[PDB]
């Protein structure tokens, strides 16, 4: 059910949030706490505040990740996502709130798939 181009801000933001959570999780194993839990409600309500800080935090995890191939593939997926969106909205609507969770969950399901992401890198 992972659409590639839904273009709804909620869906794409949920995809982005899933990417962020997975990156952070793979970055350091010894951590049960999830940034998703700490930020989910505020993010789905309004993305500007949480997302600015998340952007600032991203490079640290990105570089300190041990393996290079995971880093390049994650950056590539970020590229494949960001071109739909344009600018962080100030506020969300209800259907957007739901579609955000939908996109997040869909992207999580795609990421847990073992090799498909590596493939999509390969056709690039």
């Amino acid at each position: 059910g992972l659409d590639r181009n839904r273009q709804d801000i909620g869906y794409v933001l949920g995809r982005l949030f899933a990417v962020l959570e997975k990156i952070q999780a793979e970055a350091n194993p010894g951590l049960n706490a999830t940034i998703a839990d700490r930020y989910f409600g505020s993010a789905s309500s309004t993305p500007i505040a949480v997302f600015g800080t998340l952007m600032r935090l991203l490079p640290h995890h990105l570089n300190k990740l041990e393996f290079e191939g995971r880093a390049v593939q994650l950056q590539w997926e970020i590229r494949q996502i960001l071109e739909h969106c344009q600018r962080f909205p100030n506020h969300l609507n209800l259907e957007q709130q739901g579609l955000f969770a939908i996109g997040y969950y869909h992207e999580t399901q795609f990421l847990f798939t073992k090799d498909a992401l590596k493939n999509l890198f390969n056709e690039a």
Partner: protein, 283 residues
């Protein structure tokens, strides 16, 4: 007993903290799911004025009837030991009970109540009623996480670190809240609401907040309070034609409101002087 029915508009702003409590299911400030506006339940505002009474008068004829450790059934029962209610009958029991209850309290005399739990006493409707309040412009929550110096208990989490669980403190950067209120004389007869009591109400609102603080609440304060009074026991004009006279607007050249300076208040009294009095209280 008070005669002229009243209407009033109330404007109070929360500075830097949870203005109303968590919805008890998902702990945040109360928020409109769709518009992005914010609400404070009226009951909270009512309880604030109740506390102010409890700490201000301290006299018989001004008891409060809901206290942190009171148990309602015994309070009802003890009223069944007054002399008037000794020898009466089914209807008469209840009627005398209501008379005595309204006699001794002020909470009951001003806001209604339900007294049918045990030995019944009835209901009252309360001459004074208040609505929900709503935020003028959408509020943008903030969530904060903070740590505890020491473990809560020598529980399974008796480990040295508290970095596993921290707990959070939500907050709101700023806003305003608008509230409406009605005073109806037709009920004053049934309870004995008196002019002195109304004066207490007016003095209570303006100083409700300063005499009440807490950690979670953070600073709050009250800005506006405008009262219209009618000339006769029948409304001269319906409510809305009045309420539109008092309007507040976000300033022209501001994108985000961050203080009372941002908003702008305006008052309409072009014709209002027909048979109505506009008393300005808040400022």
């Amino acid at each position: 007993t008070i005669e002229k029915r009243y209407d009033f508009v109330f404007l109070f702003d929360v500075q830097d903290g949870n203005p109303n409590g968590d919805p008890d299911a998902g702990n945040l400030p109360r928020i409109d799911p769709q518009t992005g506006e914010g609400l404070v339940t009226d009951v909270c505002l009512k309880r604030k004025v109740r506390n102010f009474i409890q700490m201000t008068q301290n006299d018989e004829h001004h008891d409060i009837f809901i206290r942190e450790k009171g148990i309602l059934n015994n309070l009802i029962d003890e009223a069944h030991e007054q002399e008037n209610v000794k020898g009466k009958e089914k209807g008469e029991k209840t009627e005398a009970a209501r008379q005595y209850m309204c006699s001794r309290y002020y909470d009951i005399r001003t806001f209604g109540a339900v007294m049918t739990t045990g030995k019944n006493a009835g209901q009252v409707r309360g001459p004074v009623q208040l609505t929900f309040s709503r935020s003028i412009d959408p509020i943008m929550t903030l969530e904060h996480s903070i740590t505890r110096m020491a473990v809560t208990n020598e529980k399974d989490a008796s480990e040295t670190g508290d970095n596993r669980t921290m707990g959070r403190k939500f907050t709101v950067p700023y806003g305003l809240y608008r509230c409406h209120g009605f005073i109806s004389t037709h009920f004053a007869k049934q309870t004995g609401f008196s002019e002195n009591d109304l004066e207490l109400f007016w003095q209570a609102l303006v100083n409700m907040f300063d005499h009440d603080h807490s950690a979670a609440r953070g600073q709050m304060n009250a800005r506006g309070l405008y009262v219209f009074e009618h000339s006769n026991n029948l409304g001269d004009a319906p409510a809305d034609s009045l309420f539109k006279r008092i309007q507040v607007v976000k300033k022209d050249g501001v994108e985000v409101v961050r203080s009372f300076d941002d908003y702008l208040v305006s008052v309409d009294d072009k014709n209002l002087e027909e048979t109505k009095l506009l008393r300005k209280l808040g400022g």
